[PDB]
Amino acid sequence: LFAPPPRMQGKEGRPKPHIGPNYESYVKEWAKTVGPNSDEWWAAKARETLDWYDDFKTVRAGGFEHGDVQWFPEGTLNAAYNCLDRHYYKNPKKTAIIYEADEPSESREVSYEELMQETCRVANVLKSYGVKKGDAVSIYLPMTWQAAAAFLACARIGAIHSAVFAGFSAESLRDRVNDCECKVLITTDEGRRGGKTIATKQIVDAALQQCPLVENVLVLRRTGNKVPMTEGRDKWWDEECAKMPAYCPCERMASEDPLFILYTSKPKGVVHSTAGYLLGTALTLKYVFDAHPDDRFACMADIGWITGHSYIIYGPLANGITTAVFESTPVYPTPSRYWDFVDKWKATQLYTAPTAIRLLRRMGEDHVKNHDLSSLRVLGSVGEPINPEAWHWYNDFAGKNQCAIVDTYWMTETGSISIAPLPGAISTKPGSATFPFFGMDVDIIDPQTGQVLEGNDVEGVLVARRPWPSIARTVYRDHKRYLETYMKPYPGYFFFGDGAARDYDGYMWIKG
Amino acid sequence: DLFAPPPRMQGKEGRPKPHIGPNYESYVKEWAKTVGPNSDEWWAAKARETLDWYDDFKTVRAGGFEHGDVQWFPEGTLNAAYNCLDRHYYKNPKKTAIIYEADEPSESREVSYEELMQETCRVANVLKSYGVKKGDAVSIYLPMTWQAAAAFLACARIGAIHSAVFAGFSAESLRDRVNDCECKVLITTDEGRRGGKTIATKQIVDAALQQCPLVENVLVLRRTGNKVPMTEGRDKWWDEECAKMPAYCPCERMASEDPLFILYTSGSTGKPKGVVHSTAGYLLGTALTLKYVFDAHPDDRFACMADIGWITGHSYIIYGPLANGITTAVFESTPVYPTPSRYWDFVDKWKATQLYTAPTAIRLLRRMGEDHVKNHDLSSLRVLGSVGEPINPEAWHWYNDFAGKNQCAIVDTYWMTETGSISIAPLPGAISTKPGSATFPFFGMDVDIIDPQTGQVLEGNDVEGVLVARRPWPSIARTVYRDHKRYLETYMKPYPGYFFFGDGAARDYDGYMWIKGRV
Amino acid sequence: LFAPPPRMQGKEGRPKPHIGPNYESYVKEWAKTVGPNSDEWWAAKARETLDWYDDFKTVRAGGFEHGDVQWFPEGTLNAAYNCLDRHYYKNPKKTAIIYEADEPSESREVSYEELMQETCRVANVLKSYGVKKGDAVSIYLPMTWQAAAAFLACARIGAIHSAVFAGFSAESLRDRVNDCECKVLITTDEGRRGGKTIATKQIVDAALQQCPLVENVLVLRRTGNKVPMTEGRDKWWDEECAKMPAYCPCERMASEDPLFILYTSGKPKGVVHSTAGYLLGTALTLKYVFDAHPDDRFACMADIGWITGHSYIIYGPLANGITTAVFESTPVYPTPSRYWDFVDKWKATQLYTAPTAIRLLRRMGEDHVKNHDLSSLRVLGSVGEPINPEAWHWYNDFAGKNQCAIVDTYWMTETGSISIAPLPGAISTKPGSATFPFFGMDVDIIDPQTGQVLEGNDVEGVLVARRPWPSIARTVYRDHKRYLETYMKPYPGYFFFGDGAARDYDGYMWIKG
């Protein structure tokens, strides 16, 4: 058992945590988000967190049985307005994105004004291409800052953006593009990762050789090298954006209008809504990572996954804080890249994967010992349960026994973090996700009998009793597959698909 | 021959108290506020309590008969599907919305608001996937199954204009209506079942579509499951398409004067004309008429035995009853199948509180004998209504004596497709009825009798002429589809300053209105 | 120095001026419209002047550097609703347009109800053609009243209308139509001006022979003479409008959605204006610069093919709910007394003409003007080139009989509305001077040789604007780079008008010296 460190207790000049200082406060706050009278809490949080064009009347409706979950159905809003405009109107010169390029000398800060102008130009280009509200736009982009714009531009005009990981081959890209039935694709000529060149344009051409519906391609000049260009179909990002105004009006979108499609690695196109997903990600980033207005969040993931969707673009920007876009690899040029970045930009939170931590552990302790890293307050892990060795190395070297280790468990269909300790309230056990988040009422079911186990020291499958705002709403044009995968195995519950155990203290352990 | 309201309509025997009553002066006091120069306040208040608005309105009414620019609450936005399904589903998802009385009595079942809303959302998602945008036209060729309602509201959910065609029409009439409405999506069934007989609906659709080049997508509902021809690409199954869609669909925020539906006349030969009805005014009129004329209450079970292919099915089977949040009945059989006692068997089975049928069916049941009706209970009924030609005194007395057992109020209603809702009818809790009389006009309707030759308004009682309306009402027809000149010529030019119903009318000594048939 | 006349002092039964009676009152009012504390004044004026479907939250944002000027971004409204619908609801029988035809015997009044019904029919026709929100519609129309309706029709459904001056040749019309990429063109069979016939449909056919994107043409029967008609492509205005209802719902449009494109006369550039800011600017300018009152009859003798016709014939006067004049003839047809005959017949209270017309009327002699009454006029305005002192004095002596205020106005297509002009009830005028800038305009003089702002009076240089104003142009259509180079690059941090200016010892502004 590791109590919260002094940095997370509001000492040494650090901001006081939102929830604390013990387990009782967390349980008192969490009891309001579930059960009989959670509607008032969720309505207050929704009206406090987001800006609405039209206010809503009903809080929640629907259920698991037919996949008709609804949250704030009567309200209208826009994700791009909540992530860009309302922050640009308040502090245009505040930094929104710290772009850590592949080569450290090319790193620079991007202000909210610059990101908003780029987003508006891209949205104008998309509208000129004929993209309407509810259309699909494919995005095949590497980890550059403009990718964020390419996301928000879609959310600005009501288009549904489908991100494809830049490392995917031509076949997977073709499958996802064909399934989403998009007509516009946004990509780069080449990408740069770890000193290596990714031929994104060549793969895009190979895939589009079998994609009849794609008519317009927008190519970003990331490196400026010679790449083939098909006349008429493909146009340069900069040349097209130079013709458009730096502002574009925001479409007024219903809360249940789809925001993006994310294909799981026939692929499942997971669909998320606008208001519920945005509210869930904003609340999770604010509370689980104890984000504050002047914080500098750093998530070392890729925008082609749900982690990059939630905790690089939508989450941090909805809160109006600085987020980091990291393009390199953890061991380029030297295995000290992460700590050099942290010391260079004074990052306050860090969010990486267990694999990177294990690789850095195998690389030695002569790349972390001589680093300051005093700005960090929270160290997070995402993707797999962490083993004690990596957890302790993370606590001892990355945090210098002074940062809270937040091990989070979630998946693409939950939208945001489901189970994770609150850094200012929960004492952490190495390798445990501890307790569920707001709006999440999870339990353990016997797989053989289907009944719900009661008490502590139990083990079974992990299920959720009631829907939460950021839950996935459907699988794109395959709702029957959605119901079969998530609702049919255990009626009345949402099936995560992972085993879970509850120890004597009530902590939840996820089995790999 | 004057019949006072019965004890069932007086709040006795445990029945709910009437909305308006108990005498004629009470009706007059309420009706005086709905007409004249100071009726804006009453209509604004009624619109704000009756319907749920996304955006509030500022102006109540504008326009007139001269140029056909009638406007009601122009600045407000709302949705008909939200007012008919979503709010009631949020209030009580398990309440029954539709009692589906199938052709075979053993196949009848209840449909809840949740199930209807989910089906409507799936169909709306399918229509959106087909590329239907706001303001588009969708033709509906369906028999009296409950899913037909799920089709109607589906269009109303996405802002499409639905055009219903009666299932008994031939291929030529269906082709004419489809070609005139210029639709690209058609909704239909494989077969229909009525009175134990099979309607080859899909065969007629296939025959008609050979001369309808603009139709690209056909959605076929599997009502019976028998083998019917299916064109690849064009025709898709209802269940298979709806299984791929989510059970929810956001509601389009629609202007008050955005067209709600197109209804073509019953002309089997020639050029049918499409009466166009808007959203807010028509919905308000039908809701108010169903609440007051039939004295509908939240727990009532309204039963109208018309067809959804006509205006009666539009107003008092789907829109009117569901906008009030009550249970409505969808009746698929005929009055004499399997036995001439089907209506009373249905009434006793589902304990319907109100009945709304046509004089022709009542006359047929009269000629079929008294042995089929006199042995039923029928105590749940409080109101018996008649829609169509004025009911003759003989049929009126038979209806009073046997269907209501001299304990139900008989409400003879006069209206047309162009009026949207009931224009002249007695209030059951306030007005004493005479056999064969439409009594007094409804709220917002100020009717007079004009001499057909001189064109002057006949003041006083004991007069006879043509029936006209002085000022527009919320549920009036707004135009004839792409033929506004025909609309003006038919309804506005014959008597300038008045709306021409096209029927003769006589006002007797007591002021009761008697309809004398076509001019 | 000419003090305001008694007619502008609230005497002889004339309405009291909005701003007056001296320069100090004008400066006191104008100090609120510029600086760091102008947001409250602009928000109050926006919420008082226009009707909004949804209220706005932010007042202004953006700047000159990147061409991202924003005004009231979160609000929604409609220009057709503000110009037609609310006035029609308030008073349907009030006259909106006085149509002075080429033949004076064919002149007649158009009520607000009639204009609204015509606009609704045309909007329904446009919707039937498949025109969506944000589409471009070309308008090649002469100075008939229906043209105004057409404009508002494009505003009612959210389309972007691009007006082309009726005297343009086939090549210019083809270039503008091709650049705007429209699919619908609204035109007439023939126009009538000065007793002469303009073959409008012939030029339309010649241009459309090289315009592949146009599919629907709507032809208005102005004269009824026989003109060529292409089957399918061309349809008559009256026959199409007879099939549609006389009402059409208004699209709820964002404040920063484009309202119209106006090409300047290299290749033509399409100046783009927004909805809320341009409408507010024109309404305020018409209300204050011309001292318009609810019962006034404004008369502007410009053409709807230019920015003057856009701002002070259609949008500005109708947004205020007053009567505006659509003049089809020429100043010298049938006789050089046409302007004064029109003024005496319709009792116009304000007049807005070009210096060239005044010079021509001077060359025509005095016998045509000295015997008219003209007592209804209160304001005489000039639009275009700076007026000479001699023409100014002739205008003051004969048109106004030394009892009307002369308003010299300086502006351009990219400003949207009047930038520099005297307030008639507050400012004393000098012959040939634009006096002082309007509300929201903060203009200085920059020495072109050094690029530094000249401080003090009795200086001369180029005229620049420090901060954006609501009615500023937002971009050049599909050529934003050209917009930035033309208006924002030569002097960074300032908007470059492109005209010389001088400031005398009294602080008055003298355009081009």
Tab-separated table of C-alpha atoms in Angstrom, chain B residues 267-431:
chain	number	residue	atom	x	y	z
B	267	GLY	CA	-59.601	10.060	-57.538
B	268	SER	CA	-59.076	6.700	-59.231
B	269	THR	CA	-58.930	8.332	-62.683
B	270	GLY	CA	-57.466	11.676	-63.698
B	271	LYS	CA	-54.968	13.931	-61.922
B	272	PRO	CA	-55.033	13.609	-58.113
B	273	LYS	CA	-54.086	16.688	-56.108
B	274	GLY	CA	-51.863	16.515	-53.050
B	275	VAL	CA	-53.148	18.415	-50.029
B	276	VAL	CA	-50.110	19.547	-48.022
B	277	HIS	CA	-50.219	19.750	-44.224
B	278	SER	CA	-47.602	21.498	-42.079
B	279	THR	CA	-46.236	20.450	-38.669
B	280	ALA	CA	-47.169	22.713	-35.755
B	281	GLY	CA	-50.648	23.871	-36.745
B	282	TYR	CA	-51.894	20.458	-37.858
B	283	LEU	CA	-50.482	18.730	-34.774
B	284	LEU	CA	-52.007	21.321	-32.438
B	285	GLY	CA	-55.388	21.095	-34.156
B	286	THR	CA	-55.542	17.302	-34.082
B	287	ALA	CA	-54.374	17.130	-30.457
B	288	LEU	CA	-56.921	19.711	-29.286
B	289	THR	CA	-59.728	18.097	-31.288
B	290	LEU	CA	-59.002	14.618	-29.938
B	291	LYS	CA	-58.737	15.942	-26.382
B	292	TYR	CA	-61.982	17.933	-26.450
B	293	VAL	CA	-64.359	16.387	-29.013
B	294	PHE	CA	-63.752	12.824	-27.772
B	295	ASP	CA	-63.016	13.881	-24.161
B	296	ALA	CA	-59.808	11.857	-24.198
B	297	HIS	CA	-58.048	11.255	-20.872
B	298	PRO	CA	-54.539	9.922	-20.111
B	299	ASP	CA	-55.771	6.376	-19.394
B	300	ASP	CA	-58.294	6.224	-22.251
B	301	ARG	CA	-58.157	3.657	-25.063
B	302	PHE	CA	-59.233	5.389	-28.282
B	303	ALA	CA	-60.469	3.167	-31.131
B	304	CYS	CA	-60.875	4.514	-34.668
B	305	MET	CA	-61.703	2.009	-37.423
B	306	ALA	CA	-60.628	4.046	-40.455
B	307	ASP	CA	-57.622	3.413	-42.707
B	308	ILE	CA	-54.258	5.169	-42.493
B	309	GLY	CA	-54.500	5.873	-46.228
B	310	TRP	CA	-57.067	8.628	-45.605
B	311	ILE	CA	-57.116	11.792	-43.513
B	312	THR	CA	-59.098	10.102	-40.734
B	313	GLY	CA	-56.296	7.583	-40.226
B	314	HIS	CA	-53.735	10.381	-40.335
B	315	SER	CA	-55.507	12.511	-37.743
B	316	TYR	CA	-57.254	10.166	-35.299
B	317	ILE	CA	-55.249	6.926	-35.488
B	318	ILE	CA	-51.640	8.140	-35.495
B	319	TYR	CA	-51.073	11.844	-34.898
B	320	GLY	CA	-53.964	12.931	-32.682
B	321	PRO	CA	-54.018	10.019	-30.220
B	322	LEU	CA	-50.241	9.637	-29.904
B	323	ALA	CA	-49.691	13.380	-29.464
B	324	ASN	CA	-51.956	13.132	-26.407
B	325	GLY	CA	-50.072	10.143	-24.984
B	326	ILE	CA	-53.026	7.736	-24.960
B	327	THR	CA	-53.622	4.255	-26.380
B	328	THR	CA	-54.863	4.060	-29.974
B	329	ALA	CA	-56.129	1.025	-31.883
B	330	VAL	CA	-54.947	-0.216	-35.286
B	331	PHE	CA	-57.670	-2.453	-36.735
B	332	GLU	CA	-56.681	-4.669	-39.671
B	333	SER	CA	-59.853	-6.698	-40.275
B	334	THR	CA	-63.295	-5.864	-41.679
B	335	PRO	CA	-66.419	-5.214	-39.569
B	336	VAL	CA	-67.956	-8.564	-40.594
B	337	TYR	CA	-64.947	-10.877	-40.284
B	338	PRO	CA	-65.072	-13.587	-39.077
B	339	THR	CA	-68.551	-12.714	-37.761
B	340	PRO	CA	-70.538	-9.432	-37.838
B	341	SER	CA	-69.746	-9.126	-34.113
B	342	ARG	CA	-66.056	-8.280	-34.618
B	343	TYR	CA	-66.348	-4.649	-33.488
B	344	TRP	CA	-68.081	-5.517	-30.214
B	345	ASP	CA	-65.756	-8.461	-29.573
B	346	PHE	CA	-62.836	-6.047	-29.968
B	347	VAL	CA	-64.476	-3.474	-27.682
B	348	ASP	CA	-65.137	-6.042	-24.953
B	349	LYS	CA	-61.682	-7.604	-25.333
B	350	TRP	CA	-59.668	-4.383	-25.052
B	351	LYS	CA	-62.223	-2.335	-23.049
B	352	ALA	CA	-62.060	0.578	-25.467
B	353	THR	CA	-63.466	3.813	-24.051
B	354	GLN	CA	-64.192	5.606	-27.348
B	355	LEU	CA	-65.355	4.429	-30.766
B	356	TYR	CA	-64.965	6.190	-34.117
B	357	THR	CA	-66.445	4.506	-37.190
B	358	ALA	CA	-68.074	5.320	-40.556
B	359	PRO	CA	-71.836	5.392	-41.218
B	360	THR	CA	-71.483	2.734	-43.931
B	361	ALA	CA	-70.109	0.178	-41.465
B	362	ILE	CA	-72.888	0.987	-38.987
B	363	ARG	CA	-75.514	0.528	-41.713
B	364	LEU	CA	-73.947	-2.791	-42.741
B	365	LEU	CA	-73.966	-4.006	-39.133
B	366	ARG	CA	-77.601	-2.903	-38.893
B	367	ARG	CA	-78.530	-4.919	-41.979
B	368	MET	CA	-76.560	-7.899	-40.611
B	369	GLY	CA	-78.988	-8.345	-37.711
B	370	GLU	CA	-79.272	-7.548	-34.015
B	371	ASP	CA	-78.129	-10.946	-32.711
B	372	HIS	CA	-74.448	-10.025	-33.068
B	373	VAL	CA	-74.512	-6.882	-30.894
B	374	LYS	CA	-77.246	-7.181	-28.261
B	375	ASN	CA	-75.409	-9.846	-26.216
B	376	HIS	CA	-72.171	-7.914	-25.639
B	377	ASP	CA	-71.253	-5.885	-22.555
B	378	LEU	CA	-69.785	-2.716	-24.154
B	379	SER	CA	-69.833	-0.849	-20.811
B	380	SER	CA	-66.348	0.657	-21.215
B	381	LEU	CA	-67.453	2.950	-24.057
B	382	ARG	CA	-68.336	6.572	-23.324
B	383	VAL	CA	-68.263	8.224	-26.774
B	384	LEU	CA	-69.520	6.935	-30.136
B	385	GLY	CA	-68.370	8.950	-33.139
B	386	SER	CA	-69.277	9.018	-36.821
B	387	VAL	CA	-67.054	10.303	-39.636
B	388	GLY	CA	-68.149	10.823	-43.225
B	389	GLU	CA	-71.590	11.523	-44.673
B	390	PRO	CA	-74.114	12.753	-42.071
B	391	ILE	CA	-75.666	9.784	-40.311
B	392	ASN	CA	-79.340	9.238	-41.061
B	393	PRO	CA	-81.729	9.301	-38.075
B	394	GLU	CA	-82.496	5.577	-38.408
B	395	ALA	CA	-78.835	4.547	-38.226
B	396	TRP	CA	-78.284	7.181	-35.525
B	397	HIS	CA	-80.988	5.668	-33.317
B	398	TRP	CA	-79.716	2.134	-33.921
B	399	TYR	CA	-76.205	3.298	-32.978
B	400	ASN	CA	-77.550	4.923	-29.811
B	401	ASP	CA	-79.759	1.992	-28.784
B	402	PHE	CA	-77.430	-0.956	-29.427
B	403	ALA	CA	-73.793	0.161	-29.672
B	404	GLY	CA	-74.058	2.508	-26.688
B	405	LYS	CA	-77.120	0.953	-25.028
B	406	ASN	CA	-78.566	4.456	-24.538
B	407	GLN	CA	-75.609	5.346	-22.301
B	408	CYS	CA	-72.991	6.774	-24.701
B	409	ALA	CA	-72.837	10.182	-26.356
B	410	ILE	CA	-73.134	10.196	-30.150
B	411	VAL	CA	-70.710	12.647	-31.785
B	412	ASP	CA	-71.372	13.238	-35.480
B	413	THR	CA	-68.369	15.004	-36.995
B	414	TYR	CA	-68.057	16.976	-40.232
B	415	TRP	CA	-64.681	17.815	-41.784
B	416	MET	CA	-62.602	17.265	-44.918
B	417	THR	CA	-58.999	16.532	-45.841
B	418	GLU	CA	-58.266	20.251	-46.284
B	419	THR	CA	-59.433	21.121	-42.754
B	420	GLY	CA	-56.923	18.760	-41.127
B	421	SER	CA	-59.122	18.031	-38.118
B	422	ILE	CA	-62.771	18.042	-37.094
B	423	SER	CA	-64.473	21.335	-37.961
B	424	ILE	CA	-68.073	20.958	-36.722
B	425	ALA	CA	-68.984	18.509	-33.944
B	426	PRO	CA	-70.785	18.408	-30.575
B	427	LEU	CA	-68.831	18.485	-27.340
B	428	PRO	CA	-69.984	15.301	-25.557
B	429	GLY	CA	-70.114	16.832	-22.076
B	430	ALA	CA	-71.765	20.112	-23.047
B	431	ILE	CA	-73.900	19.833	-26.201
